[PDB]
Design a protein around this ligand. Sequence first.
Ligand SMILES: Cc1cc(N2CC[C@](C#N)(C3(C)CC3)C2=O)cc(C(=O)NCc2cc(F)cc(-c3cnn(C)c3)c2)n1
Ligand SMILES: Cc1cc(N2CC[C@](C#N)(C3(C)CC3)C2=O)cc(C(=O)NCc2cc(F)cc(-c3cnn(C)c3)c2)n1
Ligand code: PRO
Ligand code: PRO
Lengths: 477, 481
Amino acid sequence: GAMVTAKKDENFSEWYTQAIVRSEMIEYYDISGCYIMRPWAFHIWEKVQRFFDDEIKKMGVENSYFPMFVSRHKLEKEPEVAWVTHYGDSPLPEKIAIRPTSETIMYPAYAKWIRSHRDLPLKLNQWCSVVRWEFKQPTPFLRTREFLWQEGHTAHATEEEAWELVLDILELYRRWYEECLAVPVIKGEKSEGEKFAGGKKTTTVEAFIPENGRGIQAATSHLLGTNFAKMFEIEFEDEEGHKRLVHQTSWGCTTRSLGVMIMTHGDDKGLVIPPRVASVQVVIIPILTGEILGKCRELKTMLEKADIRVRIDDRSNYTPGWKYNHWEVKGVPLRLELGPKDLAKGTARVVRRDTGEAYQISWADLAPKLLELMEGIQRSLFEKAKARLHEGIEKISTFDEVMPALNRKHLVLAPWCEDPESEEQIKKETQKLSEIVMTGAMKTLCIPFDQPPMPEGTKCFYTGKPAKRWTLWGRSY
Amino acid sequence: GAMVTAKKDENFSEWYTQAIVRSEMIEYYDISGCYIMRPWAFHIWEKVQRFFDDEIKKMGVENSYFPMFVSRHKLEKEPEVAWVTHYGDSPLPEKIAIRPTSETIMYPAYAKWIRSHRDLPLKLNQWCSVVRWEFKQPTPFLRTREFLWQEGHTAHATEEEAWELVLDILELYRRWYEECLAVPVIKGEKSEGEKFAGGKKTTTVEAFIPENGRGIQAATSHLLGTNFAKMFEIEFEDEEGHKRLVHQTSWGCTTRSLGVMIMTHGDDKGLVIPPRVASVQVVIIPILTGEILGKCRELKTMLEKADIRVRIDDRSNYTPGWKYNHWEVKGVPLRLELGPKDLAKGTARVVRRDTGEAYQISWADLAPKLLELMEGIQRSLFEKAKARLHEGIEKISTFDEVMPALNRKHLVLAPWCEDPESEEQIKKETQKLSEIQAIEAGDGAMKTLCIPFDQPPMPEGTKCFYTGKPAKRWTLWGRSY
Ligand SMILES: Cc1cc(N2CC[C@](C#N)(C3(C)CC3)C2=O)cc(C(=O)NCc2cc(F)cc(-c3cnn(C)c3)c2)n1
Ligand SMILES: Cc1cc(N2CC[C@](C#N)(C3(C)CC3)C2=O)cc(C(=O)NCc2cc(F)cc(-c3cnn(C)c3)c2)n1
Ligand code: PRO
Ligand code: PRO
């Protein structure tokens, strides 16, 4: 048999490795930092990809594909980049490099395509792989040297429109995590030191892993503004003849979501998959003759008439207990058992994956009851995570409250004056205090949109200067 | 005013570039061999990809994604590969390679995954890009140094099942080209020298460009057989305990398809895009003031209720004829003109892209008539291309018939004994003659395309059209891409 023996609330690392390995999600590779995405993990990426694609196509964004290579001189305009130097056995003219981001590849094309305001807005997106090479230790799904992602780049006439689309894409990411993956995220504004290089303002959705008390950036949505139009000479004309700079936005989302989705919902038994991204929503396990096996196909067709995803585990050379454990660690939401007594009884027995609750349902009520079951499972999966999230955040006043809260594996919400030097000072002294496999330092995660009230007079929690906004702090990824 | 000045049947080389550039399908990148696929071609790639994906999901094939790099030792296991050596300024402990094809990447994992007969069959597929860095003349879509594709790799317990899957995948490719792209292909078997390296037998579909009389391999499906399992120790335990080798198949299809489609259908005006893959099936062009745009949007919604892809070109800054030409070079099959005189009569004037025939349809009859018209356009495009294909293939007996046919921009179906030395000699001999021909012109070899599945009868005996040996089968020959 193949199941999970590690406990999630003890050795979280080994539990994560077991849950993602013993569920046929990843496979190791001989090249460090890279992993093989098996179909069970990929059919979730497919669902979130199709959803986000439909949504951005409703916004008018069109898909495209730009090369994976970039000339050296077009990238030298403002590391962890990999370069190509040979073709078989001979050297090339210029050493071309692999894309860590397609701004320097697409924007030369944007300047050529954009001439008049009638060419705006230009909204492009592409689904591609991206290489980011670091010495540091790799972690599956979260810190991968080569990850799949979507990256969209838009160019608008005015900054108002650009900012509006930035926020719309951030809302799309919020739905991606909260509605599709049932992982609660916090919308926020990035720090000046934590924001995208060369951009004006960077928006983000942040997630929280309670087991290690670490924050992690789910997705990102940037307002580049005109800072990149200067770098790449992307200009247009209004109906007055005046050459003006375009306002650019860029945004992206990786397979890191999947990893987050796992840590938020897996338990000591393995995976739990929200019914909205589950490749197989209901698995039918026949228990043994032709009558039972043929009735299972009738029930499969019936549930497929309700757009439910059903696979019958008619595999004969496998004990039913092995199928139980197999699909338990797989994370399938509802498992459906049908034996001979069930077929005679005219009912079936389903066991939900989140709580283990058993249900006896008649065949005439099977489809709507399973719909209600999946909806309730998704809602509860999201609510438990929301509760853990808000119990993992502490509202503080001074810095003397920081180190206890960090030790409780929590985050802090503090009044901050946004002095960029103060953030580095705070990181340094939090690391120093933690010193007494990753750092113990505390940095900014975001400046949440849902801003709590700032009282009449107020004070920064570190420098004592007048505080500007509430900031989320914590040990991060 | 992006038009197409070139003539397709005169300067075809330039016509292709004009048709693909002034439709805003491709854009040029500073690195040779790499091209930017703008949305107008990518929304065709999207449709063919959704089609093939649904169809292979019916076959139990599940999608995945393997890394884009391969180790040196695992790749050199028995070229045109791009090798990564540095990160920033520092070199690497081992040099890695960018994938030309992911056999050496997936198959080490196959060896780990297959243990018993219960793990078989195993059907994987991935949609990604591959980098073949040939340093010859790059052609958009046709021969690029970086191109998108799907590659599917399967492993079975017996070879009959593997070959069955091979032929099913090849049929899926024939549907991809003839039912989606409306481009006729020929199913066939690759020669012993042109088959996939290390494989047992390669099946293929071939397409024909008449303007330069060239054959081009549309897609491919390989029977690797037992050969790769020997390389990567991919074995399983039989139902009886005997340890045996898997039988593997590998198949793939690239963006080249799109390219071929263009060459098959575009005319002197620009693109012609088959309606089953077109991003905009019907373009509504207001003749230019809300009285007209309102009815345009009403018709847009009504046609959308019939799953018709409609975009209304309400850009008031251009003349209607400019819009006509702009959506003609893009190859939109149907153009719906709605003038102010049309609003009182309650009709609209629809013009199709392939023939130019113009119809005037009532608003109520709009949806079913446009459905019928798109079906007819698809049928007529494919049937015209199929007739052109059968006009361009010459059935021959002697090598004396070869050079005439090749000079007519044609292919030859000839009885062949299938000895590989014979193929190489015919290649060299056709080149050594086409060059002597072109000497007196102020400025060409022929190779095997496929051994078609629909073999004509082979009379008793019959001599190979080049060597005089007893002929095996009718092979396709022509100048290749
Ligand atoms: C899956 C994924 C997604 C990402 N991004 C980047 C873009 C983004 C999106 N979208 C955001 C901007 C974050 C939202 C995303 O998810 C970034 C990375 C990444 O740095 N991988 C390189 C790498 C390899 C490795 F072996 C180890 C490390 C490492 C780092 N610190 N330590 C201690 C080890 C890092 N890996
Ligand atoms: C788009 C694409 C698809 C392919 N495959 C991959 C799979 C396949 C499909 N489908 C099949 C093998 C046909 C089944 C296909 O077409 C192969 C290639 C390719 O060799 N590109 C490298 C290249 C660059 C270049 F600048 C020039 C040349 C060149 C070659 N001869 N001359 C005179 C110039 C070649 N380019
Ligand atoms: O990688 C990043 O962080 C940004 C967002 C997508 C494109 N560049
Ligand atoms: O590259 C090729 O020719 C084959 C097609 C599938 C993968 N390998």
